[PDB]
Amino acid sequence: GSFTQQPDGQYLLKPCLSHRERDFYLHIKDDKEWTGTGIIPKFYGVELHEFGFGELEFIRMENLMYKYKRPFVLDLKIGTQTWDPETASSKMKKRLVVDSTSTTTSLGVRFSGMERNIGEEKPILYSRYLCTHEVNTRDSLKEYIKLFFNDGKKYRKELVPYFISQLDKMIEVMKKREYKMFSSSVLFVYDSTTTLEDKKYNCKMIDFAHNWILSEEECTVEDGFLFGLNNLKSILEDIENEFKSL
Numbered sequence: 001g002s003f004t005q006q007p008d009g010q011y012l013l014k015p016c017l018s019h020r021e022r023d024f025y026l027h028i029k030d031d032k033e034w035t036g037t038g039i040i041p042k043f044y045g046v047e048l049h050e051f052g053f054g055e056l057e058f059i060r061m062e063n064l065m066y067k068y069k070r071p072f073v074l075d076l077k078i079g080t081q082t083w084d085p086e087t088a089s090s091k092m093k094k095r096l097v098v099d100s101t102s103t104t105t106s107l108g109v110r111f112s113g114m115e116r117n118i119g120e121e122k123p124i125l126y127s128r129y130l131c132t133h134e135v136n137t138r139d140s141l142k143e144y145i146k147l148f149f150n151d152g153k154k155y156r157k158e159l160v161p162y163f164i165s166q167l168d169k170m171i172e173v174m175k176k177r178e179y180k181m182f183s184s185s186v187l188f189v190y191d192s193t194t195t196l197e198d199k200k201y202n203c204k205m206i207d208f209a210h211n212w213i214l215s216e217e218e219c220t221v222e223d224g225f226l227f228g229l230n231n232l233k234s235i236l237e238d239i240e241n242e243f244k245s246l
């Protein structure tokens, strides 16, 4: 929402509309478990750029799809609720309904949108709003994730282990419960023209505008973030199992 959402430059320069995302990146900046594990985008720093009468703060981070020729993108929103203690009351009826009619309250993960580039471009776009109808069960979420790995010619079963390995690293850090994250996503991307060796594939946690730093502030409500990651991992392992029958 804060920038035109589509990437073949090196960077994303994301505006700071509140303190939370920038406080989080600054806080994990020296923690090798966040920054050497490859589980969040490479953080270049917070920067001031001219805006209005003065300056606006931005986060400079890596563009995860830099130099991708045929990008495939899947965004999965993580947690058992997508509201937090600061959510506006006028948004709450909708947040409550979407959380309960999607897989969010049951699995702690929900479909958020997908793009597949199968040579016939324009790309095929799958709306985030599919989550309360077409992708509203574990079985249908599994089918759409399989579809992400369908490059238009075959299932890219060889990429799935990378994705599980990434989720393992996320699980290991989030077990420590230093942060609560609401409305954050795991972004899965790959270039369908990649080989394994080219390493044009990525799996990162993103969007930290509603992150709470538990050593600094109270946040009583639960995020269910670790429950969601565990469920998503379990779905990917099911997919590995299912892709052997091919």
Ligand SMILES: O=P(O)(O)O[C@@H]1[C@@H](OP(=O)(O)O)[C@H](OP(=O)(O)O)[C@H](O)[C@H](OP(=O)(O)O)[C@H]1OP(=O)(O)O
Pocket (backbone or CB within 6 Å): 001, 002, 091, 094, 098, 128
């Ligand atoms: O957070 P998302 O992606 O699910 O979508 C946001 C919408 O939520 P929904 O998907 O309708 O539950 C969200 O709707 P709400 O008004 O927050 O219910 C907005 O449309 C938001 O755009 P912005 O922050 O107003 O610029 C939308 O943000 P962007 O998709 O534009 O980032």
Ligand SMILES: Nc1ncnc2c1ncn2[C@@H]1O[C@H](COP(=O)(O)OP(=O)(O)OP(=O)(O)O)[C@@H](O)[C@H]1O
Pocket (backbone or CB within 6 Å): 001, 002, 003, 005, 007, 012, 041, 061, 062, 063, 064, 065, 073, 075, 187, 206, 207, 208, 209
């Ligand atoms: N580092 C990145 N590289 C490539 N794509 C990204 C990156 N970060 C975000 N995106 C893409 O841009 C979309 C929007 O990003 P994000 O949700 O972080 O910001 P926002 O919607 O502008 O603001 P808010 O933090 O209020 O949601 C993501 O859903 C994802 O598709």
Ligand SMILES: [Mg+2]
Pocket (backbone or CB within 6 Å): 001, 002
């Ligand atoms: Mg947004």
Ligand SMILES: [Mg+2]
Pocket (backbone or CB within 6 Å): 183, 207
């Ligand atoms: Mg967002």
